[PDB]
Structure 1
Amino acid sequence: GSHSMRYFDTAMSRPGRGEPRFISVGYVDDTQFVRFDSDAASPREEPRAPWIEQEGPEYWDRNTQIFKTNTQTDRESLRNLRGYYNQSEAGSHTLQSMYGCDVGPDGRLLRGHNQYAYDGKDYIALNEDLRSWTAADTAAQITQRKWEAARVAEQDRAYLEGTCVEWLRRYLENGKDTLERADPPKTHVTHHPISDHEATLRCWALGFYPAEITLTWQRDGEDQTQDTELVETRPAGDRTFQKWAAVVVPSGEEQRYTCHVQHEGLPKPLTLRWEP
């Protein structure tokens, strides 16, 4: 199938409680494979996938050094952004970034990503061309100027097209038994009386990987989008995910309702009904 690698970085200032915490977490699809945390008591702890451990101390030493430099850079960037927004030194602020690459089944680049948010708001992003920037406001235009002057996009392009793709391919090979395995949802429908007059039908999907899934209810073959309660897909803790979708149905009309499930691990999409 297709795959992605993405790092999710968070720098958080905490005036009066030390230097800003910096955490960088790496994922292949929905699998976390590395974590670096400036608050780590012992580097012996920062968790990593078994297939990362096999890369040895050279890989770990190089990545640890990159993380340490990234910590310094984002801390300074936090300082600069506080200034760009005329903010007091007293408040806590957050700088986040996401970067990485999407590849197809053939392992070829689909597109790259490198973008940033400040206090939860989009700030600057590398465009799909991997050459130009989109700045959200006059503050981010300053960052854009600095990054154009230093040719940062060219470095990021080289990473996204080269390093990112090559390492994603390597991780997929080393972790193939998990990373290239899609686990289909285990599905069933439950029935929950509300009153004499109506009941909830809940369609369940359990144990699936990756997280992407489509779960819908139809009534007489018509999508019930507005009438469906659909919970966010949620992690089970064993790598897999769960989701449900529910509709309120008049007593006696249950068989007019069908649940539809689509997921990468299914050879065929499912159609389910309440089975009393």
Structure 2
Amino acid sequence: GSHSMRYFFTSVSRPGRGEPRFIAVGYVDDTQFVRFDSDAASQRMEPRAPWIEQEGPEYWDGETRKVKAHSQTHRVDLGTLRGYYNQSEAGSHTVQRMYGCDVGSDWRFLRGYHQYAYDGKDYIALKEDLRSWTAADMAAQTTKHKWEAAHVAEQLRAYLEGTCVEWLRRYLENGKETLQRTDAPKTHMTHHAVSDHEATLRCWALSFYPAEITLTWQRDGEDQTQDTELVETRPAGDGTFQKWAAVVVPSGQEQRYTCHVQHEGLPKPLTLRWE
């Protein structure tokens, strides 16, 4: 299967209640392995997966140092963004940043990414070539001018094609039992009357990993996508994921309806039936 390493950063200003709250997390695929919280007592980058705990003191020290440097850089960003947008001191605002890399089945580099948002909206993103910038409004054009003059793309590119992939492979190796696994969904459908003339059909997928899955309802082979309630894929808390899709059907037409489950752990996609 293909793999990814991504780091996620959130900084939130807090007018007159001290400094911005900064939270960082790192993931390999859908498995979190580090956190930093600016409000916690430890002030340390902390392990959140068992296979990261073996990393020695240099690692923890280096990641604590770098994570703090990411935090200070976001504190500055919040100030700068309030000036670009002519915003007052009176309101809380949010900067988010995400970066990392994807590798293919052969663990070779596929793609790199480095994206910022302000107040929930795209701000600036490194393009696919790792040489250029997409800036989403006029303020972010000011950032693009500054980042081009300072050759920011080049330094990001060297990390994303090089270091990022090297550490992803190392984590994949060390955490092989956890990370190089696929757990196929355990599927079923439930049936419950909502009146004497309608029933809720709900198609379930349980205990699966990774999180990526497609659940779809058909009526006589036709997709029921506008009539389907699809919940967001959710963690079970044990390292696996769950999802369901439901339709409300007239009683008596159950046999017309089929659920269709697609997941990388399934040898073939499954069709579940009421007959």
**Alpha-carbon spacing, 1:47–1:17, altered in 2? closer, same or farther (3 Å):** farther
Matches within 5 A, 1:26-37: 26-37=26-37
Q: How does 1:2-13 map to 2 (within 5 A)?
A: 2-13=2-13
Contact 1:97–1:116 at 8 Å: present in 2 too? Answer: yes
Using the TM superposition, name which of 168-177 and 220-229 deviates more.
220-229
2:124 and 2:238 map into 1 onto residues whose CA distance is 35
- Structure 2 unaligned residues grouped into runs of 5+: none
Paired residues for 1:1-276 under 5 Å:
1-43=1-43, 46-274=46-274
CA distance in 2, matches of 1:134, 1:199: 48
The count of aligned residue pairs is 275
Q: SS in structure 2 opposite 1:160? A: helix
Normalising by structure 1, we get a TM-score of: 0.96
- For residues 224 and 194 of structure 2, the distance between their equivalents in structure 1, rounded to whole angstroms, comes to 19
Task: Check the 8 A contact 1:95/1:118 in 2, yes or no.
Answer: yes
SS in 2 for 1:34: strand
Q: Letter of the 2:97 partner, please give it.
A: S
C-alpha distance in structure 1 between counterparts of 2:121 and 2:176, whole Å? 36
Does the aligned pair in 2 maintain the 1:191–1:274 contact within 8 Å?
no
**In structure 1, the residue corresponding to 2:46 is in which secondary structure?**
coil
- 1:9 is paired with a residue of what secondary structure? strand
- Preserved CA contact (<8 Å) 2:45 2:60: no
Runs of at least 5 residues in structure 1 that lack an aligned partner in the other structure: none
1: CA distance, partners of 2:108 / 2:180: 16
What's the CA shift for 1:46?
A: 3.0
Question: How far has the Cα of 1:223 moved from its partner?
Answer: 1.1
Deviations for 1:146-169, whole angstroms, at most 9, x for unmatched residues?
A: 111211111100010001001000
Q: 1:47 to 1:40 in 2, by over 3 A?
A: farther
Q: Secondary structure at the match of 2:196?
A: coil
Measure the CA separation in 2 of the matches of 1:38 and 1:152: 26
CA apart distance, 1:255: 1.2
Query: What is the SS of the residue equivalent to 1:145?
Result: helix
Q: Deviations for 1:38-81, whole angstroms, at most 9, x for unmatched residues? A: 11211468343222111111111111111111111111111101
Between the aligned partners of 1:88 and 1:233, the Cα distance in structure 2 is 38
C-alpha distance 134-45 of structure 1, shift in aligned 2 (>3 A): closer
1:188-225 CA-to-partner distances (Å, cap 9, x unmatched) read: 11111012112111111111111110111111111111
| Structure 1 runs, 4 residues or longer, greater than 2 Å off | 43-48
Cα offset, 1:265, TM superposition: 1.2
Q: Report if the CA contact (8 A) 1:6-1:28 is conserved.
A: yes
SS at 2:161's partner residue? Answer: helix
CA-based RMSD: 1.2
Whether contact under 8 Å (2:47, 2:53) holds in the other structure is no
Q: What is the SS of the residue equivalent to 1:216?
A: strand
CA contact (8 A) 2:35 2:45 kept: no
